[PDB]
Amino acid sequence: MKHCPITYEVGKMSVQGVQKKLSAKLKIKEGCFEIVDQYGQYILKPQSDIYPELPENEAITMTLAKTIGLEVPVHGLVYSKDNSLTYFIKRFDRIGHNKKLALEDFAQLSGEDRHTKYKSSMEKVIAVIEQFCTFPKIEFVKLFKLTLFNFLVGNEDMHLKNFSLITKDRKISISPAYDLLNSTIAQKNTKEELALPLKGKKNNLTKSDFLKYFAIEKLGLNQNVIDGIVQEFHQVIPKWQELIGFSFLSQEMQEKYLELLEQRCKRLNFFD
């Protein structure tokens, strides 16, 4: 909260709702962040008092997404005033000169709300994309890649409000990535693998669920496209392992992250 970058540029279940999301402006001269109540261009996420190391978790996870080729906005870490680390991200609905871009989350687009942002499915997510996106086939490739990533890095909190459509230069597409982190290792007694069911499943998902039911029958991707993306994830595992070990996570948190990643890679036969 309010400082300058470092090495970096109710029976419900939610997890992101234990961490603050602060608006901030980038000080032009000093190059440091200033929390403001309104009219900010950045979002700052300080440490949570309930779940540990969320800023470091979010920062490395968004960097892993950038390495595999997902659209990721500028993000990083800053030291808060209490000498802890705070995550920041550049808003993509603000574009300098104080202009704005239209941005709508999938709960808004599908008629759900905050209390029911988990009462949906990835089949319903696909339908929203087919309705509103300028190039749905291009967006389906991105969705497939996003869903595989979230499974591998243990993001079980991809509810309806974590998908958004951005309207930029008259083109409607899935927004850049936001709110991606390994929420499985941040909790204890993690209850699900996927926030929204796929083929009616939120746990014990298998290779044929992602690569056959999802990729072929629901997204209509050609087999050669699926194979190329799977290969992409295969080639990135060594790079991911290196980046996590070089991150700002604690050693214990790094080990939880690596062990989860290996377990998810093994369920998709990455090492077979």
Binding site: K21, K100, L101, A102, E104, A107, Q108, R114, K161, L165
Partner: protein, 101 residues
């Protein structure tokens, strides 16, 4: 009752009105010809009725601890979603702004 101007990127787009019996209604200004307030509400219709708070506008309200922060700043009751929207309406995600009449 309570009504609010709804603007898109600074240009006044329409009026969101609190109607009796818990219903709500949004009406586009005939002069408006810019981008729609939301993709579920294009300019081909002018009037939209809602039996609850319209999901699009509910989607602009804070969540989690940020909602707890709003509720201890302002003297407003939780579940008064329209009242909370007017309080934050100067600056929300996207290009839409809300101002009370």
């Amino acid at each position: 009752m309570r009504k609010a101007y709804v603007s898109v990127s600074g240009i006044k787009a329409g009026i969101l009105e609190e109607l009796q019996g818990g219903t709500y209604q949004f009406t586009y200004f005939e002069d408006y010809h810019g981008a729609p307030v939301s993709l579920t509400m294009p300019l081909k219709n002018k009037v939209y009725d809602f039996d609850v708070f319209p999901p699009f506008f509910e989607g602009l309200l804070p969540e989690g601890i940020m909602l707890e922060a709003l509720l201890r700043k302002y003297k407003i009751d939780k579940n008064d979603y329209f009242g909370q929207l007017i309080l934050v309406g100067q600056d929300v995600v996207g290009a839409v702004t809300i101002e009370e009449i």
